[PDB]
């Protein structure tokens, strides 16, 4: 047996896959410097932002007039979005619905409405049907989450509810995130309908008429869609992570506002100007960052690394080796 | 220079960097993106 981490001769044997090494110079591996500490930097915003009244609301809007709300400059918490109901559907595209407590987003959009029971599958990327092309359309590069839950005990009534409407007739399919509130009559025929009902003149709205008696696949469902935008920005909104003091001139691993890395942070001389947040290099990688608690610029440089070679005669003659470190001045090994 | 510039390709994945892929998706799903990136980079280096 041979231990591949005892001495350079053993490493050479382990690389060559042999118990005898002949005369020559062999390239064994590379040497790096490991991190010692760990820091996390997040913005100092501590207030919360509206999530209770988005879900604990009295009346949601119809499908064709879906309610839109913008969420920014807060601290998001998603633990409270667990006990909505005994059973509910929670599907996230582009993110996993367990890791969105340590991610920083630019702007959050919340769209709320109420849908027929069996049409929940139609709120999805690139799906066709009745509401996905005439009421609510989603893009093909969506990055967000969809939540749906039962609303029989609250919405359906015995006396009769007719306050929820959808649209059935339209010229062309809707652009994503586009709303229509027109009531102009349909023109299937060749003659004008002069704003009166008749054949080929249909009013492009319809009612649900929910009653507590229909089958399990027909009761109303409440649907809310969350849209994110994970890009480069001041990062107005993100969740509950505790900050830590920053260190300099030492190889550590860092998490700057959602950007994870390892390296050495140094005071910067770049000529940033107000709107510039971070910088790049020739190879399209991050080089400079701006600390979101002091508004100062730091430069990132990976800590020392290099290549190691072993010079030995044949194992038949001796077991002595010499080590060559490539491209380094060994006053700074 | 072109070998260096190939590092910004996506190869059908959701991002051109690895840390955000590992910090946004669960282990069951990040494997496809990691495989795509690894295969693309291996092909580029082999061609070189």
């Amino acid at each position: 047996a041979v231990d591949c981490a005892l001495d350079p001769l053993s490493e050479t044997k382990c690389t060559l896959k042999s118990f005898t090494v002949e005369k020559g110079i062999y390239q064994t591996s590379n040497f790096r410097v490991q991190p010692t500490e760990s820091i996390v930097r997040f913005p100092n915003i501590t207030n919360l932002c509206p999530f209770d009244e988005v879900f604990n609301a009295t009346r949601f809007a119809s499908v064709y007039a879906w309610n839109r709300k913008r969420i920014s400059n807060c601290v998001a918490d998603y633990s409270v979005l667990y006990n909505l109901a005994p059973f509910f559907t929670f599907k996230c595209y582009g993110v996993s619905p367990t890791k969105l407590n340590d991610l920083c987003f630019t702007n959050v959009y919340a769209d709320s409405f109420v849908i027929r029971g069996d049409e929940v599958r139609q709120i999805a990327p690139g799906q066709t049907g009745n509401i996905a092309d005439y009421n609510y359309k989603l893009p093909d590069d969506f990055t967000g989450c969809v939540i749906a839950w039962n609303s029989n005990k609250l919405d359906s009534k015995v006396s009769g509810n007719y306050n929820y409407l959808y649209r059935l007739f339209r010229k062309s399919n809707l652009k994503p995130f586009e709303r229509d509130i027109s009531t102009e009559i349909y023109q299937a025929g060749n003659k004008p309908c002069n704003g009166v009902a008749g054949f080929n003149c249909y009013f492009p709205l319809r009612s649900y008429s929910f009653r507590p008696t229909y089958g399990v696949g027909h009761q109303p469902y409440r649907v809310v869609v969350l849209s994110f935008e994970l890009l480069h920005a001041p990062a107005t909104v993100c969740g509950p992570k505790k900050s830590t003091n920053l260190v300099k001139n030492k190889c550590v691993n860092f998490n700057f506002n959602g950007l994870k890395g390892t390296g050495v942070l140094t005071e910067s001389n770049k000529k940033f100007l107000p709107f510039q947040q971070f910088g790049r290099d020739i190879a399209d990688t991050t080089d400079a960052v701006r600390d979101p608690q002091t508004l100062e610029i730091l430069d990132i440089t990976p800590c020392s690394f290099g290549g190691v070679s072993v010079i030995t005669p044949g194992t038949n003659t001796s077991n002595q080796v010499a080590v060559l470190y490539q491209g380094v001045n060994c006053t700074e090994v | 220079n072109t070998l260096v510039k190939q590092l910004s390709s996506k190869f059908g994945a959701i991002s051109s960097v690895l840390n955000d892929i590992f910090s946004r998706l669960d282990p069951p799903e990040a494997e496809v993106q990691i495989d795509r990136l690894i295969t693309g980079r291996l092909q580029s280096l082999q061609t070189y």
Binding site: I282, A283, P302, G307, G327 | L3
Partner: peptide, 28 residues
């Protein structure tokens, strides 16, 4: 020599960026 000097003069940050990706150049 004179001609050798002329020939040597005739033929002539990116290096650091390449090195930080793992590509190095060995000496003769």
């Amino acid at each position: 020599s004179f001609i050798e000097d002329l020939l040597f003069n005739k033929v002539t940050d990116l290096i650091c960026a390449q090195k930080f990706k793992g590509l190095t150049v060995l000496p003769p």
